[PDB]
Coordinates of C-alpha atoms and ligand atoms in Angstrom, one line a residue:
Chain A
X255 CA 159.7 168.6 187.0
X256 CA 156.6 170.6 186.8
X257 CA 154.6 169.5 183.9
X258 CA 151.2 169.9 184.5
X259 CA 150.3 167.4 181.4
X260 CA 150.9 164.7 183.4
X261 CA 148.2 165.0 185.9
X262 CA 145.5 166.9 183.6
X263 CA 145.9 163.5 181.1
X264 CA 145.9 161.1 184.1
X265 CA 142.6 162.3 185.5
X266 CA 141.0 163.0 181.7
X267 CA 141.1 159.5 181.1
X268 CA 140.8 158.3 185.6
X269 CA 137.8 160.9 185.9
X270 CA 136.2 161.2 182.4
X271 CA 136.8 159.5 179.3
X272 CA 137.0 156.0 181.3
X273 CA 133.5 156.4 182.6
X274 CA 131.7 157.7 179.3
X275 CA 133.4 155.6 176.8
X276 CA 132.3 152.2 177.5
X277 CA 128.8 152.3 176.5
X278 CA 129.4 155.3 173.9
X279 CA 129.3 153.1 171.2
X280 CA 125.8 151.1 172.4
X281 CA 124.5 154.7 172.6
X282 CA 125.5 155.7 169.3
X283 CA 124.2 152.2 168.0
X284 CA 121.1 152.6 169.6
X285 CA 121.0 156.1 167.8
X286 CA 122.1 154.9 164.8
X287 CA 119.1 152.7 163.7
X288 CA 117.1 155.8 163.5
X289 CA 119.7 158.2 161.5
X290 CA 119.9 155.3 158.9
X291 CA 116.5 155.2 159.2
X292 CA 115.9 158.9 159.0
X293 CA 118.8 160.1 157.1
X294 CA 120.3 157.4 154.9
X295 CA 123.8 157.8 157.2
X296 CA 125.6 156.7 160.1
X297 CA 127.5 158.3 162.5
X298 CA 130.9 157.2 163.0
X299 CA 131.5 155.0 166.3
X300 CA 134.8 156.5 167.9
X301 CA 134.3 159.7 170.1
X302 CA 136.6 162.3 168.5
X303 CA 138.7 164.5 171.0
X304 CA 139.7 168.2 169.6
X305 CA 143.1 169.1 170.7
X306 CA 144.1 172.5 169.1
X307 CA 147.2 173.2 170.4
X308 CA 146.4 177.2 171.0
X309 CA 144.3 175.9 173.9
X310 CA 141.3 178.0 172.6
X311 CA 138.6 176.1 173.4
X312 CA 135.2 177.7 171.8
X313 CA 131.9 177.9 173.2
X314 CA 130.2 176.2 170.1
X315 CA 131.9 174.4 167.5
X316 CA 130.3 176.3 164.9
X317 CA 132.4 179.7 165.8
X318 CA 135.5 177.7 165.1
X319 CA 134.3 176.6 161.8
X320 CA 131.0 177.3 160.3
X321 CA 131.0 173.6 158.4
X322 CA 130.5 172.4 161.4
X323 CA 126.9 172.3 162.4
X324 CA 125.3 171.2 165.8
X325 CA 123.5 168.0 164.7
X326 CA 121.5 166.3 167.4
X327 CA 122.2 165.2 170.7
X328 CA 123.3 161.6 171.5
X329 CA 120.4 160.8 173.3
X330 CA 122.2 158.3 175.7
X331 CA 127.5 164.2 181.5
X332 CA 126.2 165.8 178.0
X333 CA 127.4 164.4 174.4
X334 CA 126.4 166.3 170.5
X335 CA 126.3 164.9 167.4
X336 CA 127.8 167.0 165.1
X337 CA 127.4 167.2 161.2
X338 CA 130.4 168.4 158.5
X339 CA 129.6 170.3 155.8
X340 CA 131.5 170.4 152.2
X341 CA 130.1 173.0 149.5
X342 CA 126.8 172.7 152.0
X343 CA 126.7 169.4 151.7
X344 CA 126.9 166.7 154.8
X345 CA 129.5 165.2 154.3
X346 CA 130.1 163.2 157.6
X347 CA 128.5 162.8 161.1
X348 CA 130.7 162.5 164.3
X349 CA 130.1 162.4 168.3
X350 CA 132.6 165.6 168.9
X351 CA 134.4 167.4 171.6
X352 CA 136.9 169.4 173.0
X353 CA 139.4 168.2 175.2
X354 CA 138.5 170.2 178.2
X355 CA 142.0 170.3 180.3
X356 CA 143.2 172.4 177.4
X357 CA 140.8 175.2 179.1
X358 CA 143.2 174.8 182.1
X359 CA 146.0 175.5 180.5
X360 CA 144.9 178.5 178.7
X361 CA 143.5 179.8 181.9
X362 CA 146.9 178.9 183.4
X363 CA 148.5 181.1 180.9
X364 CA 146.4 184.2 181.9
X365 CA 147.4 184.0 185.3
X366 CA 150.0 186.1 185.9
X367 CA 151.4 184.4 189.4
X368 CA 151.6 181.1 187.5
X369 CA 154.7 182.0 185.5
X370 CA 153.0 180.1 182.8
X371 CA 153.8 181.3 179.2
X372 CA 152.3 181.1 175.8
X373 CA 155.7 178.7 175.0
X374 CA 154.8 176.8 178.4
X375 CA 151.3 176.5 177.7
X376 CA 152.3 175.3 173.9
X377 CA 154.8 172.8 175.5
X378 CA 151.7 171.3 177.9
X379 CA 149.3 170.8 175.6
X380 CA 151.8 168.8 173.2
X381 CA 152.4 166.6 176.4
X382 CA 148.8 166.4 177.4
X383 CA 148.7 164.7 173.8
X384 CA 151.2 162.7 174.3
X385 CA 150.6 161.6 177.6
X386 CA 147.0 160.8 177.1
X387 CA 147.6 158.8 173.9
X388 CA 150.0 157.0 175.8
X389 CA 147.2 156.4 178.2
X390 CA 144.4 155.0 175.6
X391 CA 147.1 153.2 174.0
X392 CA 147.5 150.7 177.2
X393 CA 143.2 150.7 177.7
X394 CA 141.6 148.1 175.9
X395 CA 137.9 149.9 175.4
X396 CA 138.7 153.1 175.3
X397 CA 141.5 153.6 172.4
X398 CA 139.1 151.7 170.0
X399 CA 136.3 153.7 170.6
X400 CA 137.6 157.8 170.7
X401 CA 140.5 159.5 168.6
X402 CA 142.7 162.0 169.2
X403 CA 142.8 165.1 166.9
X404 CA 145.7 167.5 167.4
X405 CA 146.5 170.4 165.0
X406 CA 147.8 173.7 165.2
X407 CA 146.0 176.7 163.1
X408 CA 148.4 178.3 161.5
X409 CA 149.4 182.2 161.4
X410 CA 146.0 181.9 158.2
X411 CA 143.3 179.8 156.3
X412 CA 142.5 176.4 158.0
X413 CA 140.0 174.2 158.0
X414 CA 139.0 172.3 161.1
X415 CA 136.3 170.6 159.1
X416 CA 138.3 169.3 156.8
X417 CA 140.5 168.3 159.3
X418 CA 137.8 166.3 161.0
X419 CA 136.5 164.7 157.9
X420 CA 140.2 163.0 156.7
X421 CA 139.9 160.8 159.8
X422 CA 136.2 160.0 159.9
X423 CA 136.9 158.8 156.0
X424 CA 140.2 157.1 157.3
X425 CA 138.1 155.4 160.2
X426 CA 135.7 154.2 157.4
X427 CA 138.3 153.0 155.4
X428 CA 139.9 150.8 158.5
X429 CA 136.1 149.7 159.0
X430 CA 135.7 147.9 155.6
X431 CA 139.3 147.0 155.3
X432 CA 140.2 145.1 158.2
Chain B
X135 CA 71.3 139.6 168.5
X136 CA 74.5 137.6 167.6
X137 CA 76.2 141.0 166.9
X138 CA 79.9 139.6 167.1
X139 CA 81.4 143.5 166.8
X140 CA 80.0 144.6 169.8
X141 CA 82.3 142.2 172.3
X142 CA 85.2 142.5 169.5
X143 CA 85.4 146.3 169.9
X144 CA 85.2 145.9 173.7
X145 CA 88.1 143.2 173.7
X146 CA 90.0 145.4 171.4
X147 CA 89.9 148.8 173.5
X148 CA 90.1 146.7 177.0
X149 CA 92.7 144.3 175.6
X150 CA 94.9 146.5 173.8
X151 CA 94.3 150.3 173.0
X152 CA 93.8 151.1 176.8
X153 CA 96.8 149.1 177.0
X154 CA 99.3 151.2 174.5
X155 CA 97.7 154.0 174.1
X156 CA 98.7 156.1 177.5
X157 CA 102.3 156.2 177.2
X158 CA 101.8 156.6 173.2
X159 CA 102.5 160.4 172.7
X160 CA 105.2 160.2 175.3
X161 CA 106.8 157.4 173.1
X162 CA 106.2 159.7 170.3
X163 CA 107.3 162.9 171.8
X164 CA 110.5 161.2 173.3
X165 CA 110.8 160.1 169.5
X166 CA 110.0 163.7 167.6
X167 CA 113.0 165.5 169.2
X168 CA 115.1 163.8 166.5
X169 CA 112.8 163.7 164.1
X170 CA 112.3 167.3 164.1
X171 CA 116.5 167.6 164.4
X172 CA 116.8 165.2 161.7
X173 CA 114.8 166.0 158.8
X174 CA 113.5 168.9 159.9
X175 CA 109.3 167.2 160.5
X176 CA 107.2 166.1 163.5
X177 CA 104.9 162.5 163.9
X178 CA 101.6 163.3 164.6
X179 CA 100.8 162.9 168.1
X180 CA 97.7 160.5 167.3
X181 CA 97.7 156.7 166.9
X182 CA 96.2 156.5 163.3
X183 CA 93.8 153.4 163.0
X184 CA 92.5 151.9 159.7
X185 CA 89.1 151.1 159.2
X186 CA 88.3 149.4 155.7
X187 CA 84.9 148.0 155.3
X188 CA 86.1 145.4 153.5
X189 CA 87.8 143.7 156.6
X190 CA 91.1 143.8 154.1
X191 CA 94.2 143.8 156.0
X192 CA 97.2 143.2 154.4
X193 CA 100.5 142.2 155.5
X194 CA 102.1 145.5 153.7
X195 CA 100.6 149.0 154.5
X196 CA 102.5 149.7 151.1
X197 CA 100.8 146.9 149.1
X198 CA 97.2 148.4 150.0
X199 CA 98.7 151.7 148.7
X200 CA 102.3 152.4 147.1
X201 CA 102.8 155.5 148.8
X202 CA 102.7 154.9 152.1
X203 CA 106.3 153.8 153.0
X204 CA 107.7 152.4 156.1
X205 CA 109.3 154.8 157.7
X206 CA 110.8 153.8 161.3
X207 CA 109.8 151.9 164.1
X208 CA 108.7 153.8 167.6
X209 CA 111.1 152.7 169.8
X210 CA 109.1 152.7 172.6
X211 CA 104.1 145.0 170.9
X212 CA 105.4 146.5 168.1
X213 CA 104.5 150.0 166.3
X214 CA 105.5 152.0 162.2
X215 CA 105.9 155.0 161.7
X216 CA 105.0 155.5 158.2
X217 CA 105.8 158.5 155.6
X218 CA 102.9 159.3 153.2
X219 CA 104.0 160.1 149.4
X220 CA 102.3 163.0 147.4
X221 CA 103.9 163.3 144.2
X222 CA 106.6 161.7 145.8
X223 CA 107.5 164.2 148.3
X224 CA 106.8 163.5 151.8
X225 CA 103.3 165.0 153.0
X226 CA 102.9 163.2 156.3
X227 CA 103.9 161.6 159.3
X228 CA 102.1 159.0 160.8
X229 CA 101.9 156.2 163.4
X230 CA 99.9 154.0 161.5
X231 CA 97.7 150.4 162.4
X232 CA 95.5 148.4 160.8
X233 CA 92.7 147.0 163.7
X234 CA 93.1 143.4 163.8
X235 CA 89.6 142.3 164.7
X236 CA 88.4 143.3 161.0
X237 CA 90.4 140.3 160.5
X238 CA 88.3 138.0 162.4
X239 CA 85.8 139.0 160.6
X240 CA 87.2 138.3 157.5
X241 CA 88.2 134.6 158.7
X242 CA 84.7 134.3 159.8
X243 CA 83.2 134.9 156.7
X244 CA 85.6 132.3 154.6
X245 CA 84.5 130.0 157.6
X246 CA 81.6 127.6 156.6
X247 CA 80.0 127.0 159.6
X248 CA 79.6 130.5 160.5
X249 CA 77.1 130.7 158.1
X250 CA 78.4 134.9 158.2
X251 CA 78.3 136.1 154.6
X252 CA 79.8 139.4 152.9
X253 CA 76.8 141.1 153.7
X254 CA 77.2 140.1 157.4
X255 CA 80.7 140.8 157.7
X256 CA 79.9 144.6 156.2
X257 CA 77.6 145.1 158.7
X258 CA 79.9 143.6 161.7
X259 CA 82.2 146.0 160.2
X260 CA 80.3 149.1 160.5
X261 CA 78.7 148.4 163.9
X262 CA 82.7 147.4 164.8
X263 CA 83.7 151.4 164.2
X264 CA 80.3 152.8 165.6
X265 CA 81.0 151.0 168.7
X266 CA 84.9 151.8 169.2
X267 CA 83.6 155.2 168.3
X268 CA 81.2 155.3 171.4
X269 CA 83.8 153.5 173.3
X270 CA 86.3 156.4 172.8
X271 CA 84.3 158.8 173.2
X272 CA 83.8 157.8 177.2
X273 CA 87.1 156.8 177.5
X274 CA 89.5 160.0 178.9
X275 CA 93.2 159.3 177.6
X276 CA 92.1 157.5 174.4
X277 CA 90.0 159.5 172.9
X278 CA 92.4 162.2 172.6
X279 CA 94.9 160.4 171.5
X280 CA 94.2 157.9 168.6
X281 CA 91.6 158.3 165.6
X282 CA 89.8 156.0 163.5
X283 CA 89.4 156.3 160.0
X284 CA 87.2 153.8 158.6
X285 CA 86.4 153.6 154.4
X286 CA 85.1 151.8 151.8
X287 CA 87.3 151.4 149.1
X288 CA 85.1 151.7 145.4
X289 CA 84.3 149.5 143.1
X290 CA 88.2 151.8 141.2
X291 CA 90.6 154.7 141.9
X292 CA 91.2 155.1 145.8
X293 CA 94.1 156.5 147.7
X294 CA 94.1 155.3 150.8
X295 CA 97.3 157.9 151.3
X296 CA 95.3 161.0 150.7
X297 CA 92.7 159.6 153.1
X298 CA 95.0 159.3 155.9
X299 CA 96.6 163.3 154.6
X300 CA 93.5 165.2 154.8
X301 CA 92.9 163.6 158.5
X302 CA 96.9 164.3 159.1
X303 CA 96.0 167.7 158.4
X304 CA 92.7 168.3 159.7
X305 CA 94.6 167.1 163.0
X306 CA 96.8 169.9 163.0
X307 CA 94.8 172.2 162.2
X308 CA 93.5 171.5 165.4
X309 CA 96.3 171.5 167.3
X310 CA 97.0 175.1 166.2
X311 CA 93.5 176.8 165.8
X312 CA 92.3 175.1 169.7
Ligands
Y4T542 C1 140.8 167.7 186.0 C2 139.9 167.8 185.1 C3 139.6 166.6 184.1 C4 138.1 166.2 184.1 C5 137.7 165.4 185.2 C6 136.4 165.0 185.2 C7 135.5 165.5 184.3 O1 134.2 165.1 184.4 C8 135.9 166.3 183.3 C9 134.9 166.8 182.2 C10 135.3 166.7 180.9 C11 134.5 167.1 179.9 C12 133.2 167.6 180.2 O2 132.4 168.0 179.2 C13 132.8 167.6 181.5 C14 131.4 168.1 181.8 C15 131.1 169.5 181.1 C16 130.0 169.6 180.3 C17 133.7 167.2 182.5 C18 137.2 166.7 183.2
Y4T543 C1 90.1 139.8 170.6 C2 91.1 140.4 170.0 C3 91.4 141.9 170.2 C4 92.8 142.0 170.7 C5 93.1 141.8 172.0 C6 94.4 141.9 172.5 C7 95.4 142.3 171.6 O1 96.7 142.4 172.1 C8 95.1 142.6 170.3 C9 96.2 143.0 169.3 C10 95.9 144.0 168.4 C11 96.9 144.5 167.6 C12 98.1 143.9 167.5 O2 99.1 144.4 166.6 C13 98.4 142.9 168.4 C14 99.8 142.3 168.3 C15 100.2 141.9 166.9 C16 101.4 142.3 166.4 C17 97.4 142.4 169.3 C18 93.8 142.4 169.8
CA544 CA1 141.9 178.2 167.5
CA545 CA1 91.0 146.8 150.5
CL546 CL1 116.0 158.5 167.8

């Protein structure tokens, strides 16, 4: 009964993340001779998917959080590296990206003959996590290389780059251990 | 005369450095996007090749001179990319090559029959870089983009690192002055 989720998820994963995934891993393989090479580090394997639940989707990562510095681009319609900073240190390297269909919903909740609310708009983007983790869950090369990363900042001190950086060390953790 | 350089020069331009050289830089500039993202230097543009006298190629760059250090291979039979070490600090960038008809020469003088001696293979070796030299010079793409840096080493302090670094740099002080 008029969820929007349900068809924003659908054709994510139908129009987008279906199509780029597959070889996202060869191209950050290919990439990651040279980093190890370079820079004595790897960059993780899974494409990591930002799902803020305020919908506010920034033009560059860095305005969201300053840690978190444009890299380098995966060399391989458009993919960045991305590196996280602790104390100014790197501390972890990451293909990352915002869920775009969450731009849709905020842009929904600024148009007034929508009858689309903050509390609708908050509602949606829950389900468009749900539903597309439903999704990946029943795809067999696409859930193993992306994740899902949903938070809500708070009302105020967050860190998104920490945020990040507990699942690229829990990814590396799940590497080595099984 | 029975000058064996003279159709070993013209089988190594013909045979391989016309072959490889062409596409080099692109190979190289394709490569120094990242390298300039990634730690913040550039490759020279230049195929580097080593001259010695003594027709001694070894199988190591680094065991003819500790600080020259494998760096990474351009992706692009098969060309280094080597870091030179001042102090040990990087000073240099480099795509770096032995030529491999000195090693002929070699061979031919630990060859009885040849009847070539030390003295012969000196003078092979000279006339060897005076005649790629002429070659390059008439040849349009080639020229430009490889230099040959040919040296005796002493009989006994030599670094054949700073010999490559003050050619490294006269090269961009080219680039940047012309
Ligand atoms: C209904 C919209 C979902 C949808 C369908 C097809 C797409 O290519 C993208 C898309 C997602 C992320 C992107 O980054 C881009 C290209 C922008 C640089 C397209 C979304
Ligand atoms: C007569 C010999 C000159 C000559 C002719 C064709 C060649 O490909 C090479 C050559 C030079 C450097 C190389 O590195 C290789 C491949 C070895 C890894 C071949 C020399
Ligand atoms: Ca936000
Ligand atoms: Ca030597
Ligand atoms: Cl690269």
């Amino acid at each position: 009964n008029f969820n929007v989720a349900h068809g924003l998820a659908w054709s994510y994963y139908i129009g987008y993340l279906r199509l780029i995934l597959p070889e996202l891993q060869a191209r950050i393989r290919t990439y990651n001779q040279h980093y190890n090479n370079l820079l004595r580090g790897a960059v993780s394997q899974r494409l990591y998917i930002l799902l803020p639940l305020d919908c506010g989707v920034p033009d560059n990562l860095s305005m969201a959080d300053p840690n978190i510095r444009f890299l380098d681009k995966l060399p391989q319609y458009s993919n960045s590296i991305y590196e996280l900073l602790e104390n100014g240190q790197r501390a972890g390297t990451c293909v990352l990206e915002y869920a775009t269909p969450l731009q849709t919903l905020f842009a929904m909740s600024q148009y007034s003959q929508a009858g689309f609310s903050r509390e609708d708009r908050l509602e949606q983007a829950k389900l468009f996590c749900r539903t597309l983790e439903d999704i990946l869950a029943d795809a067999p090369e696409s859930q193993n290389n992306c994740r899902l990363i949903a938070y809500q900042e708070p009302a105020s001190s967050f860190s998104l780059s920490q945020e990040v950086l507990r699942h690229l060390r829990q990814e590396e953790k799940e590497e080595v251990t099984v």
